[PDB]
Structure 1
């Protein structure tokens, strides 16, 4: 009857593949800015570059504790509200649907549910009954691990993070209290980590006919009621992943290039030994977190809190059905995956710190010695151009005897450090002999160049203490 018209009507729905779900964020064009600022202990080089991030994915992350709309097999509009992950459901009258669940220990036939009139309470009711039986049958006498998924990203802008984690991330992100300002100023580095623990997945298998999803009751072709066209078409929820998920902000004041490594070591089981750079970074890291799966909670504190956050809910048991943490949609017409294409431009701030240092000289040789020590001071002008300003030790070329000592302060902007040391041999037609000569000397924390011995046999030590 009218459903035979629905089959071919939906099959006649002509809509643009991959394009109707495409959205793009804010835009900006390539502009070079590179500055160098002398902080009292470090020279800091900040480099900003236009970057783009694009994602194309099937999974939609759930941020709402109470679903109301995100039950499996729900039909949602393909609309502005869908892209922004705040969908609008069209509810009138639904036909029965079969579902499947991937729990281990379930005999094949028992993995299938048959729901009469699909709704939130309906489907969740079925699933919860099934689970109640499964926890006693299998769950409490077996050790079943949840499936674990990590995603992570360095934070630069809220739009970037929206593209990464979903268009409805902003509320959660606001709860994480992300200091984008300090990332832009080069004073902080921030990583966002999404951790998902999947207990089970309720999925809908292939739909033979597009009409099978419907009874025959009311407004069958008249379903053009409110905006259901080849321009504003329908989707159904192909699957919903249930479990627990955590959004984790790791925010450090370190300017080090070992931040990501330390964060990675932290997320894993690795315990970090003291007096390490990792240990210092993690000491200076603030942790914020949003836990889901009676609602979403905001916890805060130090790095040690991460372990627990990750271990909790690792084994699926009763006392919690888990909440929908993800869902995946497929178009009515065919097996078509509904992939969401998002992209945005963002400003990437890169920071490089150059530790200040000291060059110490000790002369205890039985000879006249001369030093020739030169370097460049690095600056960036207002056009971001590299400028090198030549500098020299003020006692260059002067005759020095034992026991001479000095300390030469070298800020982090020092480049092209050259040290040459020679001694007067007292020999006719070989008046000078080079004791030491190096160029491009690394600006370590503490370098001590000592010379001793005699005119004939001068000796030298180049001692590096970079701690």
Structure 2
């Protein structure tokens, strides 16, 4: 008999489940460069470092909208196309199969769905008609909330993002306009956030015998004609989660330590602190929304930080006006019901940034004496190794005799280090010609420092005024 042979064919298969489901991303040699770059208002120090990301997961994120391959109980072939989340469907004559839907407020009597010929349209139709009946005795009367999961990552490379969010993420990533060259060059920090909102799940019970998914007319010949063997075995979709999904790009020009907490308060809808409000106002937002709204189709929006409140709560309620579309699914090996787990890894270059604000040094001389200034500092940069170089600098008027009223502003960029200022005045006394008015080394590079000198040859005075908000 055909079905017994098919049954025995599947049971006879031995394969390495781990090796079949492992994929290796791009290989980058180990590196570390420390680079300086001067922006208009700040000096940015950039550290690059080769890093690796690896994930082992059974949940497969859905980027498509109306994928007819991704129905509960669908048979998929285990090959490279499955690892790339673009699977080959085995669409042979299917036996009936019993499903269970999991949905708030439902006695396990209407939980089960018997579909005679499993396909996307037939499973779809069976679930949507049960839902239609669920709308009129629970959907509206009882308030039925969606189940929210969210995950985040700092964006560094698209290969990295694919390892985090799934192998077909670029369908999503291309629509977010992610500026990887700006994070690398050090003038942007980007976080990608994914919000899932699960309305309901449709699961398949364990398949007792592998032959139980095929009609009696399906032969070993038919399966081998479609390339099925121990080399390309079968899985079945054992569960599908339905709801709304949001991919959120947060891109800022700030170089702050507080960006994570700033973005986190917004994911949370928390009142922003003063250091974050700077960052949030310099944040751009792009979003891909995968339907919790009629119809099944991707919406790619851009906006302000203020949008994120609305994008998370829009389809947070499943009154089942419109059924959600697939947002993830899990597969299990037909042979033995072992859940298929996918191992993905990649190397990527991590960029971490540190900013140093530019500052001004102001001098006021209102004293009744000749003063001389000796202002020196080092300019920081990095050689092509990433090692520190300190080139010494000096104010062009150092040691010159200056008289009141003298004022000037010396612009000091963020790369200035070891700022030392010494001021002396000519007392006119043969026995004590010069007197030191001010002498400080390693002055903090505040936004604005005003060193004012006044008084007389005998009683000079000084003020060191800082403004650094």
Range of TM-score over shorter length: 0.7 to 0.9
128-137 or 282-291, which deviates more: 282-291
435-444 or 315-324, which deviates more: 435-444
Q: Hey, what does 1:4 align to over in structure 2?
A: 4
Q: 1:332 to 1:434 in 2, by over 3 A?
A: farther
Structure 1 residue 318 displacement after superposition: 2.5
14-23 or 335-344, which deviates more: 335-344
| Alignment partners' CA distance in 1, 2:68 and 2:54 | 30
CA RMSD of aligned residues (A): 3.2
**Residues 442-461 of structure 1: CA distance to partner in whole angstroms, max 9, x if unpaired?**
21111223456789987654
Verify the 8 A CA contact 1:153 1:192 in the aligned structure 2.
Answer: yes
Q: 1:451 to 1:274 in 2, by over 3 A?
A: farther
SS of the residue 2:211 aligns to: coil
| Alignment partners' CA distance in 1, 2:97 and 2:10 | 18
216-225 or 295-304, which deviates more: 216-225
225-234 or 36-45, which deviates more: 36-45
Gaps of 5+ in 1: none
Verify the 8 A CA contact 2:234 2:335 in the aligned structure 1.
Answer: no
76-85 or 160-169, which deviates more: 160-169
Structure 1 residue 264 displacement after superposition: 2.4
432-441 or 311-320, which deviates more: 432-441
Q: Hey, what does 1:57 align to over in structure 2?
A: 57
Verify the 8 A CA contact 1:5 1:221 in the aligned structure 2.
Answer: no
Structure 1 residue 275 displacement after superposition: 10
Structure 1 residue 221 displacement after superposition: 6.8
Structure 1 residue 359 displacement after superposition: 1.7
457-466 or 425-434, which deviates more: 425-434
Structure 1 residue 133 displacement after superposition: 1.7
**Residues 138-196 of structure 1: CA distance to partner in whole angstroms, max 9, x if unpaired?**
12112222111222222232222222221112222222222333333333332222221
Structure 1 residue 254 displacement after superposition: 3.5
Provide the aligned length of Structure 1 versus Structure 2.
465
| Alignment partners' CA distance in 1, 2:423 and 2:205 | 80
Structure 1 residue 314 displacement after superposition: 0.7
Verify the 8 A CA contact 2:265 2:272 in the aligned structure 1.
Answer: no
Verify the 8 A CA contact 1:219 1:225 in the aligned structure 2.
Answer: no
Q: 1:179 to 1:205 in 2, by over 3 A?
A: same
Verify the 8 A CA contact 2:9 2:220 in the aligned structure 1.
Answer: no
TM-score by length of 1: 0.88
| Alignment partners' CA distance in 2, 1:114 and 1:374 | 84
Q: Hey, what does 1:108 align to over in structure 2?
A: 108
| Alignment partners' CA distance in 1, 2:428 and 2:324 | 87
| Alignment partners' CA distance in 1, 2:90 and 2:208 | 22
Verify the 8 A CA contact 1:150 1:193 in the aligned structure 2.
Answer: yes
Structure 1 residue 15 displacement after superposition: 0.7
Q: 1:206 to 1:453 in 2, by over 3 A?
A: farther
330-339 or 178-187, which deviates more: 178-187
| Alignment partners' CA distance in 1, 2:430 and 2:130 | 102
Which residue, 326, 341, 344 being the options, matches 2:343?
A: 341
Verify the 8 A CA contact 1:191 1:250 in the aligned structure 2.
Answer: yes
Verify the 8 A CA contact 2:5 2:219 in the aligned structure 1.
Answer: no
1:298-309 aligned within 5 A: 298-309=300-311
Q: 1:375 to 1:97 in 2, by over 3 A?
A: same
Gaps of 5+ in 2: none
| Alignment partners' CA distance in 1, 2:169 and 2:39 | 36
Verify the 8 A CA contact 1:2 1:221 in the aligned structure 2.
Answer: no
Structure 1 residue 369 displacement after superposition: 6.5
Q: 1:64 to 1:390 in 2, by over 3 A?
A: same
Structure 1 residue 20 displacement after superposition: 0.5
SS of the residue 1:152 aligns to: strand
Verify the 8 A CA contact 2:287 2:302 in the aligned structure 1.
Answer: yes
Q: 1:206 to 1:428 in 2, by over 3 A?
A: farther
Verify the 8 A CA contact 1:192 1:248 in the aligned structure 2.
Answer: yes
SS of the residue 2:199 aligns to: strand
Verify the 8 A CA contact 1:21 1:340 in the aligned structure 2.
Answer: yes
SS of the residue 2:172 aligns to: helix
Q: 1:367 to 1:337 in 2, by over 3 A?
A: farther
SS of the residue 2:322 aligns to: coil
**Residues 319-341 of structure 1: CA distance to partner in whole angstroms, max 9, x if unpaired?**
21011011111112324221111
